[PDB]
Design a protein around this ligand. Structure first.
Ligand code: ZN
Ligand code: ZN
Ligand code: ZN
Ligand code: ZN
Lengths: 146, 146
């Protein structure tokens, strides 16, 4: 029965507790021990879908080619991805998952879907009017953190 | 105009972005550079109020005496607090801020009040019924993270 301010405080405290040293909030049992940044895991997820290039990656992930390079290089060092050259265009460097990465990508993607479906399920317990309230609260609150 | 699940995702993403390497969400301009854990800063805030003992501290902060010891020892190493012995009872080890700590405590406390007052202000833009909605949403969401 605390104030909303206190409940918001506890909620955000619970998020930071839950995040521990991670920078991404993800639900779902987590088996992998492969320490990845979020940008790195998202490259993995992308490549689980389709062998891709740094251009297509930067575009898809809406980050800079430079940041894609940094992540690829780290992923590659960890032998989670491997570069190849496109058979039809020698200028084209492709990136794809190594077999070691496939479960890592598929796991992170499963987290994403588990998390999002949990939020959607929650969302669905509220009526439109309630969802607008929650959406307006979230927007206001998000603004305080940007 | 995204789904609520997506907005919740973005919101939590914005929190993790905002937190960066911190484990406490705090609003307010931050000048101090004194790297502290949250438990350490809260001991500081306590001692800004009143010279205190490890017992009174563990009680007030609802953590174990053992965790108080760990924090005090770190604070003490950083010369942010100093131990003294109670003049009326030689068995009593008191802890108080060093002059260096006073602005650090007062700053962290100011963060707490700034953050909480910002949440309260936000809270106050919503009617009771809306606050219950937000409170119920927060509770449900908090449960997914515990
Ligand atoms: Zn996992
Ligand atoms: Zn992710
Ligand atoms: Zn500060
Ligand atoms: Zn604090």
């Amino acid at each position: 029965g605390m104030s909303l301010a206190n409940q918001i405080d506890q909620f955000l405290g619970t998020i930071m507790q839950f995040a521990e040293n991670k920078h991404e909030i993800l639900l779902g049992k987590c088996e992998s021990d492969v320490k990845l940044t979020s940008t790195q895991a998202h490259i993995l997820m992308l490549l689980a879908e389709q062998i891709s290039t740094n251009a297509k990656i930067a575009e898809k992930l809406k980050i800079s080619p430079a940041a894609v390079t940094k992540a690829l290089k780290k992923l590659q060092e960890q032998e989670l991805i491997k570069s190849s050259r496109a058979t039809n265009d020698e200028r084209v460097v492709l990136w794809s998952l190594t077999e070691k990465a496939v479960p890592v990508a598929k796991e992170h993607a499963t987290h994403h879907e588990k998390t999002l479906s949990t939020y959607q399920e929650l969302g669905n317990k509220f009526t439109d009017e309630e969802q607008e309230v929650i959406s307006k609260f979230l927007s206001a609150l998000t603004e305080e953190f940007q």
